[PDB]
Amino acid sequence: MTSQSSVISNSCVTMERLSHMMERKAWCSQESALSEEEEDTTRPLETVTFDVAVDLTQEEWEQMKPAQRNLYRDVMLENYSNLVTVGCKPDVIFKLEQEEEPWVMEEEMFGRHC
Amino acid sequence: MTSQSSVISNSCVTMERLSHMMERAWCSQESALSEEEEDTTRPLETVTFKDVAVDLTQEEWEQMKPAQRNLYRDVMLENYSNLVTVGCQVTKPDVIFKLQEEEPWVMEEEMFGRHCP
């Protein structure tokens, strides 16, 4: 009741995690562009594919704080509804939006009613 | 014990400065030659309060200790109280919906927030 801080940071953090987030992925050798020249224009794109998301795991669900636990679902998941909302829904998902966790043990028989 | 800091400058400085920022009044008035007085005709036209503000810039705000942020909005929140207390009336601009908790670059795009309590 004497340390009522001043609070300079609290609900405003990532705002200092961006600069430790968006530098990665542009890397190495851009030396002397030895493959210059050109020619023509014709061959189509090649729709990337959702090669965007990393399939899940059974075993590592204890090493995941509500940042790693929760979230996760959002970012991988930020790719999608922005191209499926301008340009160009896997059962792989279906477990993302409804609390719980991917495995419902329906295998075999008993667990009791009460 | 001892070390009874004669609180030389707590609250006491942002009280003192003045001669330290509000000075940064230039380009001369060196013997005029350009002139002419005339009838007080053509209208004013203010400058408004659209431009007298800064569309908060996306990447910035790393460094700038959020006292250079918290005080910030409270800058363009602190020209506004002539224009919403005595003046000629502008309006509540776009970007405003932040002047607000979390942050400007909050998200709603792409939903979800994965289950927990």
| CA within 13 Å, CB half, A80 | 17
A88 contacts A47 by C-beta, under 8 angstroms: yes
User: Taking chain B, what is the end-to-end CA distance rounded to the nearest angstrom?
Assistant: 47
CB spacing of A12 vs B102 below 8 angstroms: yes
| Method used experimentally | X-ray
Distance from the Cα of A103 to chain B's closest Cα (Å) equals 15
- This structure's resolution (Å) is 2.7
Which residues does chain B have within 8 Å of residue A82's beta carbon, measured at their own beta carbons? 109-110
| CA within 13 Å, CB half, B92 | 4
CA-wise closest residue to B49 among B18, B94, B8: B94
Q: For residues B74 and A12, give the distance between their C-alpha atoms in angstroms, rounded to a whole number.
A: 17
Residue with tokens 């594919």, as numbered in its chain: A49
A62 inside 8 A of chain B by CB:
no
A72 contacts A97 by C-beta, under 8 angstroms: no
CB spacing of B112 vs A98 below 8 angstroms: no
Tokens of B102: 């979390």
Q: For residues A73 and B112, give the distance between their C-alpha atoms in angstroms, rounded to a whole number.
A: 6
Count CB-CB contacts under 10 A for residue A10: 10
Q: For residues B78 and B71, give the distance between their C-alpha atoms in angstroms, rounded to a whole number.
A: 10
Q: For residues A3 and A6, give the distance between their C-alpha atoms in angstroms, rounded to a whole number.
A: 9
Q: Is B83 helix (H, G, I), strand (E, B) or coil?
A: helix
CA distances from residue B18 to B14, B15, B75 in whole angstroms, order as listed? 8, 8, 16
CA distances from residue A114 to A100, A106, A111 in whole angstroms, order as listed? 21, 18, 10
Single-letter code of the amino acid located at B73: R
Q: In a mutagenesis test of the B interface, which of A22, A74, A89, A93 is the best target, namely the one with the most B β-carbons within 10 Å? A: A74
Residue B54 sits at the vertex; the CA angle it makes with B53 and B59, to the nearest 5 degrees, is 165
Q: For residues B3 and B32, give the distance between their C-alpha atoms in angstroms, rounded to a whole number.
A: 59
CA-wise closest residue to A95 among A87, A107, A103, A83: A103
Tell me whether residue B56 is exposed, middle or buried, using C-beta atoms within 10 angstroms of its C-beta: 0 to 12, 13 to 18, 19 or more.
Answer: middle
CA distances from residue B96 to A39, B46, B55, B62, B91 in whole angstroms, order as listed? 50, 21, 9, 21, 11
User: Which helix or strand (DSSP H or E) is residue A11 part of?
Assistant: none
CB spacing of B101 vs A8 below 8 angstroms: no
- Ramachandran region, residue A25 (left: φ > 0; alpha: ψ -120 to 50; beta: rest): left
